[model samples]
Target: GQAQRLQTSSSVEHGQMLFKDANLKTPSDVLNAFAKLDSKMVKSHAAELSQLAERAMTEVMLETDSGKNLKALIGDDAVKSLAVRVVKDYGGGVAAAQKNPEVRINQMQAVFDMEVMHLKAAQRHIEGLASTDLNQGVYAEGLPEDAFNKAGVTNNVERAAAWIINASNSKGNDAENITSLLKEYATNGKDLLNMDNLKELHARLVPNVERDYRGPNISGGTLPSSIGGEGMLKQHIEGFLKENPVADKDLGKHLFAGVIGYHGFTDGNGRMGRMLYAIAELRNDSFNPLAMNAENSLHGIK
Candidate 1:
């Protein structure tokens, strides 16, 4: 029964600690304790993936104290250049690939994640090297970006999501009736490699997934339906095969694009689009990018 006045910062901190640890038995108890703040940290976590994506990349590039260690792995100017490329070329995965959709998605995902992991590592390295405790520790996803960067690898939710997408499709860029991408995965240090029956084994992930998603309706942005409305989607799929001198490029892109057109989530068209993109690329001896997950330490993939 304390007097109801404006609370101080210390009091707010105490309250947060209490909330984090409190075992309130009822909804009223929880609400009464938490109602005083201008915004609860949990509730105020209004981070958009796009915004976070931007921030995470920028952090490793600009923040000298925090970003210095990370700069070494990717070189000094790579981040700015790459981000510009992303904004310019993919529109951050906005446009449909006119050429090799599978290869494009895979390559993009790979290099993107590689850099993001590097940035995450730089953040952690800077934090660890600092003399004072920076309670506001930056983590890309749940792990320290610095750790992933130093290790030169990442194996978190983001990577897992990318892997799922990568394994789902059948890239037609390889030998007839054989997935070229699958051949590549086996070559890399992946667990799914060298399976006697790779297609039969990986076929389980083919369904119940989000496909060609149009993002949330923004004023100037392209609509999901519009991308497919002009027969652009069909053309992209069919065109790849015509250019590839190969089997069925249309099969994966067509199916994956269909998945996107369905609008699977309330938001997250980019993530789901990348996921389907990864799936489509797995058919042949191509690649799956899955870069967003490892990029800027975002979790759009997994």
Candidate 2:
């Protein structure tokens, strides 16, 4: 009799299970809940977000130990755990909303899209931590005062890195002229599209003391008209420059392909192409393109 009484009490509480009444009576109501939830998360995590930005700026640099350094500085496990929680909450909330077919499928899909956006934003934030911080003292020592002044752009660490690398590489018969030419380009970028400009830029960047036309001579080729001769190379550049006002996205592709793709120079094509792109951006946008480091540039463009 006692056992039967206990069983009756348990069944009564289970049948009387209740939750606070909600306003989600329609599909719009369900969608609004998702919006509010996202808003609340951003508001609550605002402090953490700010801290992450700070860490990324002051500590991050494009180096070999970047990943390990970021983990140590930002506590990867903590951030990753928070990311997991955000994903779980979004998934659970969406699943609950699906209980009612009245929920707008399109609105539900939008919420799912935002979920992807959040994760991708986080990925970019992390990757950006690999960039240089221009305010560092190392930049002061890496580049000379004159070169820095000529560069004319403040808070640009990649430019400093470029100066350092190019300076180190310019320690031979052509060293002085190459250094002088780079400084001039960094400052002016005038007459930067002509064949004369190409020859001048190539001469400075390479270690060869011999000043000759020495145009595209791609070996291991049993053909003549395939990759283009010196005349064809000149035509490639002229063709690109003829097209007035190229789009921002297509600018890199055109500049890199014309110079590097055609193997316009016997050597230093990579460096020359980068310089051209930066100069083009500076001329067009009035701001130097961030000088991507060697590792960063490997996958950047041609």
Candidate 3:
């Protein structure tokens, strides 16, 4: 493991030290810091590193001015092209053709990682469900008492009034914030499913940490006219609801797939679709997946 271990101090120093240096213009210089990791660790960590990197980059863009300025300086196309070339040349050519069980070991860690979240879910969502659309009474009437018991929720009332009771991987607030906003929109059940509202939600959703997406010039971009236009998004939502006035699981699944398929937003469409799924289910008087299962998602649906 010592040989396999990445040089944490050196790698950290390289990245941080270069930041204070003058003429730090190109991303490729910093991006190459990833190469500092051992190649064996690289193959083992490819997927996990990507998820962690997404979270880090997310925080950097939202909260790190130096990081944002760094991105702006290097340009999105620079990172995008550099990553693509890295994957193509090294990943595809050098090692992609050969099989690696390192990928298997990586995925097996998902369960282990989730268990960490379960243990890390320290306090129950002490705040009221008022912040969300979750219906307490009805959600209470139905419960997986056995499953909830395993998560340490022994009371039916707690089951009814839960949002992140035993959820959250990192101690950070991003997942909580996003899931909180998710519950807020999903509980409407139907109110915010319109084209106009969809755009606003996507705008908020794109920022990842935003509490409100109501402002002008939110990060979400419309579907290009070249493909199907933003109208395509409207068409899908309107068309589906038209056929199935009252949504059930099937309709919920359809809308999730369709919206994500259309992906009207330039980014954050996956979260948008997940929100739609929860909302659509509420049309049938069901709680959003979070009410019962913290891990509920349409990740497998599409």
Candidate 4:
């Protein structure tokens, strides 16, 4: 018999490291910091930044030459971003022959992208490109577990916990630090990228009893004082990078956002989590489909 080739998907691990190094302390930071970077892009190249943001987002989200369908991919988020850009920013929302799949995917493609601008997610977000959309199948694109569905858990806190576990792909139920916890149980104690493994990770994140309004809105309801302050924030951010280890550029920008945004993680949520997402993408020399930037947003809105 011929030698059977082995493909372990080193890219996913490489990507996770990239995100960790960048300082993706919490999940929302992933999007918020990206937004800040997007804003700078707008400032640097006002006339063309918007278009560029859109293109980048599409490339990251869909991962195909011909942009994927927004309707089938990310769903409402993608459309919401486009609506804001065209109606609010651009001042003209054109009605094309094609339907609005801005937020979701067209259901025809295989993968999704989400290159950012410290990376370039913002540009692709605003362009309303089909490729920047989500997938339509049961589990398409690089959606973070519940990023696609809302099963399990009933309330927001549980949801947050679920997402954390899913993202970490962990197994144990410890809270020493976000990165440590994730690394401990990454991949449901299995393959980090597997569907079944993801679900297991979700189980660990949620606490048996969720608080009412203690935690910050990034992951749940309120940002706990526990995660606040620059000193503590730095600790979490640095700790995460130490364990995971991502590329330099991604790590710096990722940490920058944490301190700047004061993201919901008490202190460095935004910074830590965003970097982690980037690392996840970098693993495969790939990009995450879940993007967060101005191109995917609107003023007076999200």
Error of 1 at 193 (Å): 24
| Candidate 1 C-alpha lDDT tens digits along 1-302 | 12221131223323334445345443223233433333444345323222322322333223333233323433445334443344234323211221223443344444444444433333333222223221223211233344223333453333323343333343343222223333343344442221222223233223333333232122333232222221222322333224433233223333333224322232333333443334444444343242332322221111
Q: Write the per-residue lDDT of candidate 3 for residues 1-302, one digit (tens) a residue.
A: 22222332332233344233333233223333444556786677565444333322222222234323323322343323323322332232213222432342233233223322321121012111113333344322334544333555543223322323333221346555555665676555435447778777767655644332121111233222111223334655655356445325345445554555443455565566655655555555554443323222222211
> Candidate 3, residue 5: CA error in Å?
69
Q: How do all models score by TM-score?
A: 0.21, 0.34, 0.34, 0.20
The total number of steric clashes, by the backbone 3 Å criterion, in model 4 comes to 90
Per-residue lDDT for 104-216 in model 4, tens only?
A: 32321221122111112222221222232223332132345456235755542333344444444545534334444434543322433232342233334333423222211
lDDT of 2 by residue, 137-244 (tens): 321122244553455546433453344346346455554554455456657745655676777666756647443332111233311111122223355455434545
The lDDT for every candidate, in the order shown, is 0.32, 0.39, 0.39, 0.32
* Ten-residue region with minimum lDDT total, candidate 1: 1-10
Position 156, candidate 1: lDDT: 32
- Candidate with more favorable, higher TM-score: 2 or 4: 2
- Quote the lDDT for 186 in model 3: 52
RMSD of each candidate?
A: 24.3, 23.9, 18.4, 23.5
Question: How large an RMSD does model 3 have?
Answer: 18.4
- Model 4's alpha-carbon lDDT is 0.32
- Model 1 segments more than 4 A misplaced: 1-162, 165-219, 224-230, 240-289, 293-302
Full-model lDDT, candidate 1 = 0.32
Worst ten-residue run, lDDT, model 2?
11-20
Clashes of 2: 0
